[PDB]
């Protein structure tokens, strides 16, 4: 089957440098505009 991953409600997100596992940016998006 196909898993539904619909990001249509507030979420945390972060950008990671994978080899070092260093978080470069972190955020929460909960409010459009």
């Amino acid at each position: 089957h196909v898993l539904k991953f619909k990001v249509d409600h507030p979420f945390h997100f972060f950008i990671r440098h994978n080899k070092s596992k260093t978080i470069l940016f972190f955020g929460r998006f909960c409010c459009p505009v």
């Binding site: 898993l3 260093t22 940016f25 998006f29 459009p32």
Partner: protein, 350 residues
Amino acid sequence: ELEISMEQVSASIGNFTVDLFNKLNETNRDKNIFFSPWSISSALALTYLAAKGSTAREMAEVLHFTEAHEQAENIHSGFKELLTAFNKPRNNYSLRSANRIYVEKTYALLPTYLQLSKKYYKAEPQKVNFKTAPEQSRKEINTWVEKQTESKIKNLLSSDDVKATTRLILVNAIYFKAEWEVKFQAEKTSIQPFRLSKNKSKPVKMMYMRDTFPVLIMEKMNFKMIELPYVKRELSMFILLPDDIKDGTTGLEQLERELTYERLSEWADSKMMTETLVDLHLPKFSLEDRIDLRDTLRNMGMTTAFTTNADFRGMTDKKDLAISKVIHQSFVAVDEKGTEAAAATAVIIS
């Protein structure tokens, strides 16, 4: 040795990220949050290099260089090697970070501090005239930040930040831009409702694709996590999404209550996080923010550095310096092609 140093700094930054987010979240539960913990920790680490006694100890504890003063040489070494890794020459995407020391021309700094700052943070000193030309100095610093950030962090410092009393400004900048490994197709993007809560939603440009990504399903803890790699999977965007909206606000109450870096680290490289075919819907979005972190850092336990009892005799022979402000400014734009992200941190000392 160097590998362990890098792991220790990366771990410290991860712990700091969660603590910082948690502190920011206390007052602003219903607002967008976005920062670069790399940039903040880098600038404060360069500041910590100059700190002594309780000033140093508090900073080390808040930044997770030590557990809650002997300088953490392993940390400075870890920052050095990480900075080198991030600044590797490449033309397949953009990743760069830089540090700089702006100092009052009349204010002498210890040579040992400058060589260590150059070694571990690649930060060179630039003499500026704060005393009788604060606006000249401000614009000079803002211009450098613009250059390091492809003009995405424009006017970092304001006239309220740089004054005749300013003696040092330690600045970190970071810039990132990369395509997704698998890009969204613009034709599949459409206007869809984004649900702020159970009883509220607003329209956003929702990108869509069907493809395979690493996904961790945590049914018991009511969330899923996905990894969206950028080119060559050298960096990724991770997204933590609650299973639905199962509380009276944003849906993130459980996740935010139970958020720890230990958990986040375990999830991010879990064996359960396997490649899964997914109908991925992701908003096209962009966030900008700016904050003086003084109050936040004080509330986290970094207090003495902001007082008349501050001790920065690692960079000077006089006990006449204290941190006035810690300005952090950030930017991110997520679209079908990839992501552009940028930030700067300015530690202002007077």
